[PDB]
Amino acid sequence: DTIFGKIIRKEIPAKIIFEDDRCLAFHDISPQAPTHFLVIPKKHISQISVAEDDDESLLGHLMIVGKKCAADLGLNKGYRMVVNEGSDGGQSVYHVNLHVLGGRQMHWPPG
Amino acid sequence: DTIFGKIIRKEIPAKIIFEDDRCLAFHDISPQAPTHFLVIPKKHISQISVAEDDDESLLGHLMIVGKKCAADLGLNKGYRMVVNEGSDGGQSVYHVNLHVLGGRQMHWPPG
Ligand SMILES: Nc1ncnc2c1ncn2[C@@H]1O[C@H](COP(=O)(O)NCCc2c[nH]c3ccccc23)[C@@H](O)[C@@H]1O
């Protein structure tokens, strides 16, 4: 399975900042901002392009959890949420993952 | 209200590529990729940091609609989804909006 599959199954260790029945959040190993963490579903969805209609609430939950974690981490000046799909998106771990980045001005274009 | 509020109320014209009872999608006026469109809720939420828990399904719907529009627009090599919060996120229109960008390699960091 993927790296994130291994984190979910508790095969690879990770320092978590949030967990519930539906998702996990943890800091990125290669941070691109002073604050950079990930929110991932526990359900295996390899990429957002294959998410099903009934995954709507789960995907929204990732963003609500991202919002809450951002607040807890003191990102009061703002942040950026990112989901990458496939090669052009730069996906590297093929498990749906929401990036939340902040603590610096985020620029444009977003990559 | 905001620019997007005006688009929703059909005060400002916009060429739409998707509409339902909950959201609208349309191409960005200042595209940053060969394909760059936006998905916005019809409900007024000024920024993701003030989204409520019960907005989970709506937020997920934006991503599912983004996914579907991306497929329709032929983004088979991938894409990137982005939501900006506040000043550090680069928010400029204070109405929740999901960017979908593709048709080129998206780079890292994402801004
Ligand atoms: N054990 C662990 N704990 C915590 N974080 C972990 C981790 N193992 C891995 N990560 C992280 O997962 C993230 C996977 O995100 P992604 O959206 O699949 N690819 C985005 C990065 C990227 C790569 N190549 C690109 C090319 C062009 C654009 C972008 C890129 C990475 O930020 C980082 O590797």
Ligand SMILES: Nc1ncnc2c1ncn2[C@@H]1O[C@H](COP(=O)(O)NCCc2c[nH]c3ccccc23)[C@@H](O)[C@@H]1O
């Ligand atoms: N009528 C119309 N039809 C179609 N698209 C329209 C439009 N009117 C406006 N837009 C678009 O809304 C988007 C608003 O996105 P945002 O996430 O609020 N800001 C991101 C851009 C940005 C700005 N400054 C920054 C600084 C640092 C990082 C980023 C930035 C813009 O891409 C573009 O202006």
